[PDB]
Symmetry: T
Subunit: 169 residues, 12 copies
């Protein structure tokens, strides 16, 4: 009626966040920024491994590392965009990046080191994003779908790294 229009007019500057938004906006924003930090850390680690993984066999892994690195940055972009829509600020500050994150930057010494560290990070991300998807439930479909999409990519990343690690003894 004229109430639908009045409901939309109230707090109009809140944009995507309407009166019917039933999630905890503050908490979803916290989770998005933690994921953002995790993605940025994983981007830097993978790029490091990409340049360092030289040699015939190792170059195959280096290709995966770079492919993954840029996919992590796409995840960062998806998350940063949602942070803006939900009224937050995406934190790209390198200071304290690792502490905000669920991941660590680990140089590694050998190819086995690099492959394992990426595999651990992918598995940390998988379980962490599964839990967020549960927390969101039906309160925020748009954010849930972002994590659902990122999750499937992280599961592919973990499968990719495990397939390599199995040949590395």
């Amino acid at each position: 009626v004229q109430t639908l229009r009045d409901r939309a007019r109230k707090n109009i500057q809140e944009g995507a966040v309407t009166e019917g938004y039933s999630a905890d906006r503050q908490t979803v924003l916290r989770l998005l920024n933690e994921a953002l930090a995790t993605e940025l850390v994983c981007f830097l680690r993978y790029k490091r491994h990409y340049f360092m993984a030289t040699g015939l066999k190792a170059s195959i892994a280096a290709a995966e590392f770079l492919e993954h690195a840029n996919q992590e940055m796409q995840h960062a972009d998806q998350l940063a965009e949602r942070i803006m829509q939900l009224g937050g600020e995406p934190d790209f500050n390198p200071r304290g990046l690792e502490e905000r994150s669920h991941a660590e930057y680990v140089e590694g010494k050998t190819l086995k080191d690099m492959v394992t560290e990426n595999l651990i990070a992918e598995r940390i991300a998988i379980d962490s994003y599964r839990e967020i998807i549960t927390y969101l439930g039906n309160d925020d479909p748009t954010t849930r779908r972002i994590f659902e999409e990122i999750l499937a990519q992280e599961e592919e990343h973990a499968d990719d790294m495990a397939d390599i690690l199995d040949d590395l003894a």
Copy 2:
């Protein structure tokens, strides 16, 4: 051969099988209302697109056109689903606004246009959230349409608010 006999019965219903657990007639009503809403928002954005002239306004005018054509994609997604679920998609311009959750509003200033669009996006968001809830797990294919459309409307609302915040 029991699976085959279920599919063999009422074969002409096509996508709608013995396992379709939603209230098909109601889903069809909701789909047509959404279709009317998308067509109205398409016409509004096209109006604003042509009228938003000037340096700043041309920036909004680009968004207006981008959004207009996205609204029509949603209309197509909804009309296609109406056909699959055994209904008829209503493109009749008569009573279009009354079928709709949105209004066609010309606006006089850019702030008028931007606000009217923002109001429409926020109305659609809450409507599609409710439909998504009503569907539940009874119709994944239709639910996913509204979830995909919903996400776009949330982006449109963010886009329009980002503009409105600087206009005054």
Copy 3:
């Protein structure tokens, strides 16, 4: 805090995508994925048959739909097989017993109305079969659920497509 998340991930690391938080029945999900895989392969072969045999002016319009659907069935086959690998299984492409593993049948058909009906029946079998899998999965495995949800939507489109044709044949 950081070392508990990390210690959960280090345990059974070779399991890859399957983490400690994976709450589905990995063994059963794998069985369902391979049944769907067999179904997609069977439907791919039927549609390719119908594509080549559906000659004539009107039938060539159906023949196009048949080929489009065939290649979509193979995309579904690849999608399911990739998930089978991620969950630690082996995707079964063996043509022996392919039909018995499947939810659908290869049926040559004699007339175009036969071909359209057999395809329409298969689509409707897949729709209800995959709806049940989506229900079985619940919230335990979003990634697999999303595969079936996407395939389901395509089968509903295929069923509508075949039904739209069948209504004009008699």
Copy 4:
């Protein structure tokens, strides 16, 4: 002789494309453009309705034409709306009273022959309307005339397309 051309351009400069030499009846040309815009919007909506409803083997062939035509009608709408702006008017996309502003009607039709005939009628109404407008414009407004000359040619093609279909139905 240089500062008179320049002074002619300075007078009423905000009028833009409409120069001192514009010899047409701007107010009337604007009315004709908005009537055409309403007609294109109605024809767009009719064709989209027919596109979705024309299912079956033969009908899918018409449905392709229906969609092709629908989107061409929207291009005509855009061309007309852009010219309305250049000539200092406002393009009216309001769905209220759309049909009364228009030379065409939204007609659902029940059968394919209904849909094809209704489209054919609309195309032929547009052809004679735009012929008259082109005559009314004459040499007073080449730019607007060329828009209608371009749209007319497309509408003649639409009419040929629909008649070709109708000849096999009836």
Copy 5:
């Protein structure tokens, strides 16, 4: 007003693009289109002949032009044939009597200067021929007029191209 436009469109609906307002001599416009169609087909064959026979360094430059023109002539042929159908005629592609229906001749030529000159003659025959048709049409048939206006401009470009070559051939 609403129902007289519609009654006018409904009458003789099968005539398609040709509405009650079509003021040209449909029978004669069709005769002119088929003559032009024959000319384009003849000119296509001449240019292709010259394309294959014009070998050598210098000649290959002309041969490229011959081929470009050959295919532009065929585009004009299709363009005319499509309008013939819209106006209710039949486009005559019969090679029998093709040359006699035409305004041009197939002339093999022995030298490059022969080939260039014969093409230049045909271009100049078409230019004046299509100028006369454009005048005959006047405002009675904008859509057909624009076809000849567009073809004419291409033919004037063809004549310029051939003349530029002939000037070096002495």
Copy 6:
């Protein structure tokens, strides 16, 4: 050695036609020109049918007709180019085109007429080109391959047209 070069020097203007060209060059040239005329006739017939085959079912045929028309012209170009290589002249004269040809231009009144006339022409070309391929044998691989390629297309055209004709009545 120095004879290989001396064989190439002799009659150098004959170009592709070397001392080893063992076929009956004048006869091959006649066959190429007869085929060239056949393709031009088939091009004109199909283009006629393309424009005249209007209506719902018939428009499906019209698409095949146009597709075929342009393939016939590719064959024409292929043959005319080979005529040049073998020292002849490609004859595009519309006068007597039909008499030089193995096929006829036939307008047809019904769609069944058009489809049948095309089907008859395709089957004529098939047998003509089969015989030419046999006649050439190994004496002229380059020309043989042109006919082998054209033949394969004509067999497809015949299959296409017969498939249509079977449901027309």
Copy 7:
């Protein structure tokens, strides 16, 4: 049809200009070269404004400036090509370029200066080309269509510049 052929043979070197060309070839060439000069001047003005229109709002104008500049050069090419067809010489001499044209090169100091000067040139061009289109009448369809097509672009340019100027003050 032996008179048509002899008509074409007479004065064959004149090319596109046939015995039936009813316009004043000499004057049309004069009008085309004036138009060519206008297009070249407007090209130079717009390129100047493009480089000088820096800033947030102004960069929006700068895009239109560059878009228009290259559209002006396309018009210059159309006119030059037609000059050749009608037997003239296209004059690209920068010396006296401004005196030959209907428009001026004006640097402008502010953005409002630049926009106003472009709008003035567009409206001068619009009325000049309207007159040429009338002068040509039915004597030269091909040249008329060139000016008709250019005219329509100038009306778009005038609308584009007016829409900007209305917001500047």
Copy 8:
């Protein structure tokens, strides 16, 4: 007009004219056996593609997929020829292997997979050489299909042998 009467007789037979000197029935049998071989080889390679994981094995897995899709191109090429010659292409998975000249073999190691593919390629090479001989000059269009497929199978055999030489 005698050529025309020759073409009119048995017109519905399409591509198969009076001059068709091959044994149409036998050529059709061979095409369908080849079609079965291509389908089996498609399924084997697809299995190997998904199962060949690891650093080295992924290199083989790429070849496996490339070949898999080339096999399906051959399948289509053969099926279309079956239609032109008036037969029916048999895609039924029942008895597919018995109709085929090749086997589906899962393999346990990468060397097993590579070896099984190499065996299948060498079986096809010799099968298609014999068919090319049988056809002779009786059916150029069919012969050329086998000649094209043959060259691809020879490429496949070289690719697989090149892998196998380094595995042990």
Copy 9:
């Protein structure tokens, strides 16, 4: 003869670094890693500003911000690759990134803040890379050319940001 080959064969594993490499490789490597840290910091700042610069005018700046961000990452890749070729390790560690860098991550509160911080960072890099180009001289053309190319891009970035800043006040 064999002196060219024996010279190349000595210390072969050093790869791109031949006997003729006359630069101070360890120092060049230090400069390369400092620049890499600068590029990553500038990447993160620009991405922050890109997401935060909302509104009609600011969205124009946001586009420049994103364009620049990705060019900064291209520079990072270019430097990291040269680090590898010259026998070092590229440091992507986010800990202490800002201290290894010549630039700072600064969120900024206003658009003028963001633009000014970016302009300051661009001008720091310009002078820094000019000095490196001088330090390199003719001893290492390949590395010199990398900084020359980056410098030219940074000079464009400084002009871009300065052009925005004049309209901001």
Copy 10:
């Protein structure tokens, strides 16, 4: 350090021109505008020759003429953009264009005239830009690289024109 930052803040609006800019900005700007005049003049000459060079043989030269014309315009844009970065104004005024230039607009009567006049202009530019490259030295790498790149293009143009002229007589 914070002096590095303060150095960037001093005269911040000067953008690409930093405190370390050691060239004579005023003179580099004068040289850039002269070259801009040269490129515009050479653009106009080549366009004239392009339209006027008709005939079989001449059409080959006409193609080179147009290719070069558009390459000259690219140089023009490249120089004009650098003029902006260094704080000047690019002068596109057609008035006095030729006097500001190092080249002349020359219509030429024969094809040999056109080729010769173009060849002369190319060789004037080659020596002119070599001197500018020397004057710049190490003071302005970014500008030096622009002239170095343009120079290479002009040397290619000279070789192209000489190759034509050698066969013309």
Copy 11:
């Protein structure tokens, strides 16, 4: 018989494409392939030399043909080298003795007519060499035969191209 086909394939499996059914003289076919490979490389170097040296308006036309042909020669070289590997040989790219292994010569030429003739001579040498190789192969090796047949047809085109140029040179 399913295990004899398999046993034939298993015997000498490392020979790859070379099966028990390979009826040609593998050693001799490899010799001929390497001779052709040398011929193609020499012809590549000749054409590249001619491409750079053929300056002037008329000559620039020839230079384009020279470059196109040069790169087509390199495709032939690759095509032959790939077949050499498949048949179990080693492709010899050694510049030492390249000319002695080849059927053609590297000839700089002084005039354009020199360059064209030398290329024309080389094309005609290859034509007769490859016709003989095609005959020698007969039905023993279809895959290799088809390589020479495809290369041959290109060489026949190259010869026509050079002769067409030479005829106008004097």
Copy 12:
């Protein structure tokens, strides 16, 4: 000022890109360009040999680099040859004495490590050779110097690529 620049350009006009201001030793630069051209052609031939012979899973990875490098070498060859023409020389593509003109050798290699090492040696020979030429050129010839600076940078990348491979080979 105007007519002196013009007179300087007019003197020795046929020398083209080489103006009075060319301060390098043109004869010597031409010698160095031709030596480099020989090196690039030899390196092209070596890498092509290695590309075809490096079979196997790991080696196929090297084979890709080998082919990528081979074709980059040919780009360098063309870049150098074009500059030879501009400076008034003739690029020598003669395979006779090619190796003696070159700074590198064609080496077949027996193992993959052999192939990788020979390429690595060649890259390092080229790297120091082109650094010296860049120094010899100084500021006398920017256009040629930039060619060598660009080629050098590619060779440093090639050397790094080959070294990266060699470390894992043993």
